[PDB]
Amino acid sequence: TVRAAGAVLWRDATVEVAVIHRPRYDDWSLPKGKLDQGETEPVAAAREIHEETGHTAVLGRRLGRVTYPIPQGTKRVWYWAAKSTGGDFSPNDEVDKLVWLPVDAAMDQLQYPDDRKVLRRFVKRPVDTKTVLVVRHGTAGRRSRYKGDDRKRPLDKRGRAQAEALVAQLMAFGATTLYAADRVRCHQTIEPLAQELDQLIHNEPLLTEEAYAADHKAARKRLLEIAGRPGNPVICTQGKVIPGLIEWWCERAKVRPETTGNRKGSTWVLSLSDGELVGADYLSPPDEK
């Protein structure tokens, strides 16, 4: 019942991680806290890291889910690896001490078994990763009811709201460059993000459902091309293209999706290290759980 998110916030020492002390429970733990209304887990994680540690951070690989019982029902915390991009700590509302420890010492500092389990996930794969964000376009009504060229079918009111809600989510992962398939609804999905970054959306005719249907290899090739460029790209496409591209890349690399889906407005976070896939994390559409 109670949804939360947090992080292993790290910095280059080789790495040190942040362990926080809170007076209420006199505990040592990883920074995390509750989703506010309208936030998704990554949005909440980045926010809570800032509030509890004073550091700005960019989320990378997901580090699984923790659940435990509380007074208000059940607590569920999703965790991310999060690289500090700077900031400074000062005792605040929730937290009065913060220590940066190398992993072995941090393991001994962390008193909850689940936090230790999260830290063990953290060290099991590279954490200095780049991120490709594959997004299914937002809701766009029904083909049946669109009088016009279906390629031009726009987002509906709900999908416009999904597009706005996606900016904070995608920014949590340090999105830098934007790409969309050659359909109105894919471009509109990331046009709020484009404004926020003052970036142009590159058009990708090779990544439409039609194009992929006739040459899937050209599309795979384009994806790796895009992935190879500097930065963390966002690629917004249609439903029939995503599953094929995600399964292809996952089995290549023996990466397993803990969660999975393909809903309108959903995001796959693909984490790469030295060009090799090290995570594939499926995020629900920003207005579903």
Annotated binding site: 22-25, 27, 32-34, 48, 52, 68, 75, 94, 112
Please report where in the chains the tokens 């766009």 appear, as a residue: 140
Q: How far is the CB of 145 from F ion (least distance, A)?
A: 42
Give 178's strand partners.
201, 234
C-beta nearest to F ion: residue: 33
Q: How far is the CB of 112 from ligand ATP (least distance, A)?
A: 4
Q: Give me 78's structure tokens.
A: 């999703």
Among 33, 126, 243, 244, binds F ion (CB under 5 A): 33
Q: Give me 71's structure tokens.
A: 């007074």
Cβ neighbours around 250 below 10 Å, total: 18
Q: Give me 186's structure tokens.
A: 């894919």
Q: How many residues bind ligand ATP (CB under 6 A)?
A: 15
- The one-letter amino acid code at 226 reads I
DSSP string, 98-124: EEEEEHHHHHHH--SHHHHHHHHHHHT
The listed partner (ligand ATP, a second copy, Cl ion, none) that binds 198, CB under 5 to 8 Å by sort, is a second copy
Which residues 104-143 are close enough to bind a second copy by CB under 8 A? Answer: 121, 130
**Contact pattern for a second copy over residues 68 through 87, marking x by CB under 8 A:** ---------------x-xx-
The answer to whether residue 228 forms part of the interface with a second copy (CB under 8 A) is: yes
The answer to whether residue 257 forms part of the interface with a second copy (CB under 8 A) is: yes
Nearer Cβ to Mg ion, position 22 or 117? 22
The answer to whether residue 54 forms part of the interface with ligand ATP (CB under 6 A) is: no
Q: Give the span between the Cα atoms of 121 and 116, in whole angstroms.
A: 9
Phi, psi of 121 (to 5 degrees): -65, -40
Nearer Cβ to F ion, position 47 or 121? 47
Nearer Cβ to a second copy, position 89 or 199? 199
Answer yes or no: are the C-beta atoms of 243 and 277 closer than 8 Å: no
- Judged by phi (left if over 0) then psi (alpha if -120 to 50, else beta), residue 275 lies in left
**Contact pattern for a second copy over residues 191 through 210, marking x by CB under 8 A:** ------xxxx----------
